[PDB]
């Protein structure tokens, strides 16, 4: 599997006016933990984060090209990108490499710029945009996160319960994986503030 060459899994999750994006922090070659502060959640606006996963070079390359097209958009436009626009952009970008695909499985989490409606979406490594309403995951340890999220998620959770849910989701979900973990980062995206939180994960 080329995808699990670096490992790492990122999920988002939707609340009551706030979507929280998580990620692990283990940049590792196959079995060798190399770094514990590798960035996977790249901001794309005041309230819009695009968490990527997979092979490292496609993480950073997709993030940087996307930030290219996004600064061109915001400059050439008069406006920050709406989350649905950003989703169609990233889907276009992964799909331009249809036969040489970036091994990145992004999930985009954020708010409407004007109305501040929560938004998420996950994509596959060729760009099948799959907007959802409860959550998304991505990366080498997707399954454990489907279990923990599908069991822990509930309709209309305010920010704090959201941080509890996504907290335990990432912790339990990565501890049962070898190629991920080494800490966890979490972002709550409210209407007015943005809280960054790292978590105490097993260091082994």
């Amino acid at each position: 599997s080329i995808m699990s060459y670096n490992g790492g899994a990122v999920m988002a999750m939707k609340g009551k006016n706030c979507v929280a994006i998580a990620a692990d922090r283990r940049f590792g070659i196959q079995a060798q933990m190399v770094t514990t502060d590798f960035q996977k959640i790249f901001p794309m606006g005041d309230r819009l984060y695009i968490g990527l996963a997979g092979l490292a070079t496609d993480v950073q390359t997709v993030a940087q090209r996307l930030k290219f097209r996004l600064n061109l958009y915001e400059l050439k436009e008069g406006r920050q990108i709406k989350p649905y626009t950003l989703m169609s952009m990233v889907a276009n970008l992964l799909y331009e490499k249809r036969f040489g695909p970036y091994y990145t499985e992004p999930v985009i989490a954020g708010l409407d710029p004007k109305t501040f409606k929560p938004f998420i979406c996950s994509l596959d490594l060729i760009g099948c945009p799959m907007v959802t309403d409860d959550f998304v995951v991505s990366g080498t340890c997707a399954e454990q996160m489907y279990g923990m999220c599908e069991s822990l998620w509930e309709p209309n959770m305010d920010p704090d319960h959201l941080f509890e849910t996504i907290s335990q989701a990432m912790l339990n979900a990565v501890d049962r994986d070898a190629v991920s973990g080494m800490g966890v980062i979490v972002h709550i995206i409210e209407k007015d503030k943005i809280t960054t939180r790292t978590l105490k994960a097993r260091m082994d």
């Binding site: 196959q30 079995a31 060798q32 933990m33 049962r176 994986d177 070898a178 097993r202 260091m203 082994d204």
Partner: protein, 201 residues
């Protein structure tokens, strides 16, 4: 998995981590990796698990037959050598078994390494498993045959600790025994990450 063992003034301490990973997935993470054969034998395990469990348990069966027949408490040489024959019979059949036989015989603390191929090695310092090399590095820089049991134990926890820190296939809790003159005694089954935070601050 990372498994090491060394011997010094006061016997032989064998430390093993406690994660067992089916490929990229962590099957169980408080596994007991050190099969206790006799009151004072000790054989660790590594690689494919079922080979170590079956062949090393069977090794305990041979040792028990010996101890009933000759009544003289089979030595470490016969132990590692006999397991060496169980492995050498099925050469190249795919058995993935890298293990170590710690003990205490008439000649003294006999530490042996028994490989899937038939490799058999006495020695002072060993470290097997997927993350063995790290344990080599952190053991050597900090090994000296005049270590007391305390400094020995801390040295083990540092070894298995960082060995599971840089490794992907290793973690959980660290088992670490102390094969004294009158037999082993389990010194600790310590959490790993808590150790790494005690070592990072």
């Amino acid at each position: 998995t990372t498994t090491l063992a060394f011997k010094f003034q006061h016997g032989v301490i064998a430390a093993v981590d406690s994660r067992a990973s089916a490929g990229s997935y962590i099957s169980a993470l408080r596994v007991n990796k050190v099969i206790e054969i006799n009151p004072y034998l000790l054989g660790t395990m590594s690689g494919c698990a079922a080979d170590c469990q079956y062949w090393e348990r069977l090794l305990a069966k041979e040792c028990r037959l010996y101890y009933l027949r000759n009544g003289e408490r089979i030595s470490v040489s016969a132990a590692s050598k006999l397991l060496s024959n169980m492995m050498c019979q099925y050469r190249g059949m795919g058995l993935s078994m890298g293990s170590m036989i710690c003990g205490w015989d008439k000649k003294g603390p006999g530490l042996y390494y028994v490989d899937e191929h038939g490799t058999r090695l006495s020695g002072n310092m060993f470290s097997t498993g997927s993350g063995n090399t790290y344990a080599y590095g952190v053991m050597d820089s900090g090994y000296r045959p005049n270590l007391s049991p305390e400094e020995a134990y801390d040295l083990g926890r540092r070894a298995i600790a960082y060995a599971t820190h840089r490794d992907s296939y290793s973690g959980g809790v660290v088992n670490m025994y102390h094969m004294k003159e009158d037999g082993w005694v389990k010194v600790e089954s310590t959490d790993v990450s808590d150790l790494l935070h005690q070592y990072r601050e």
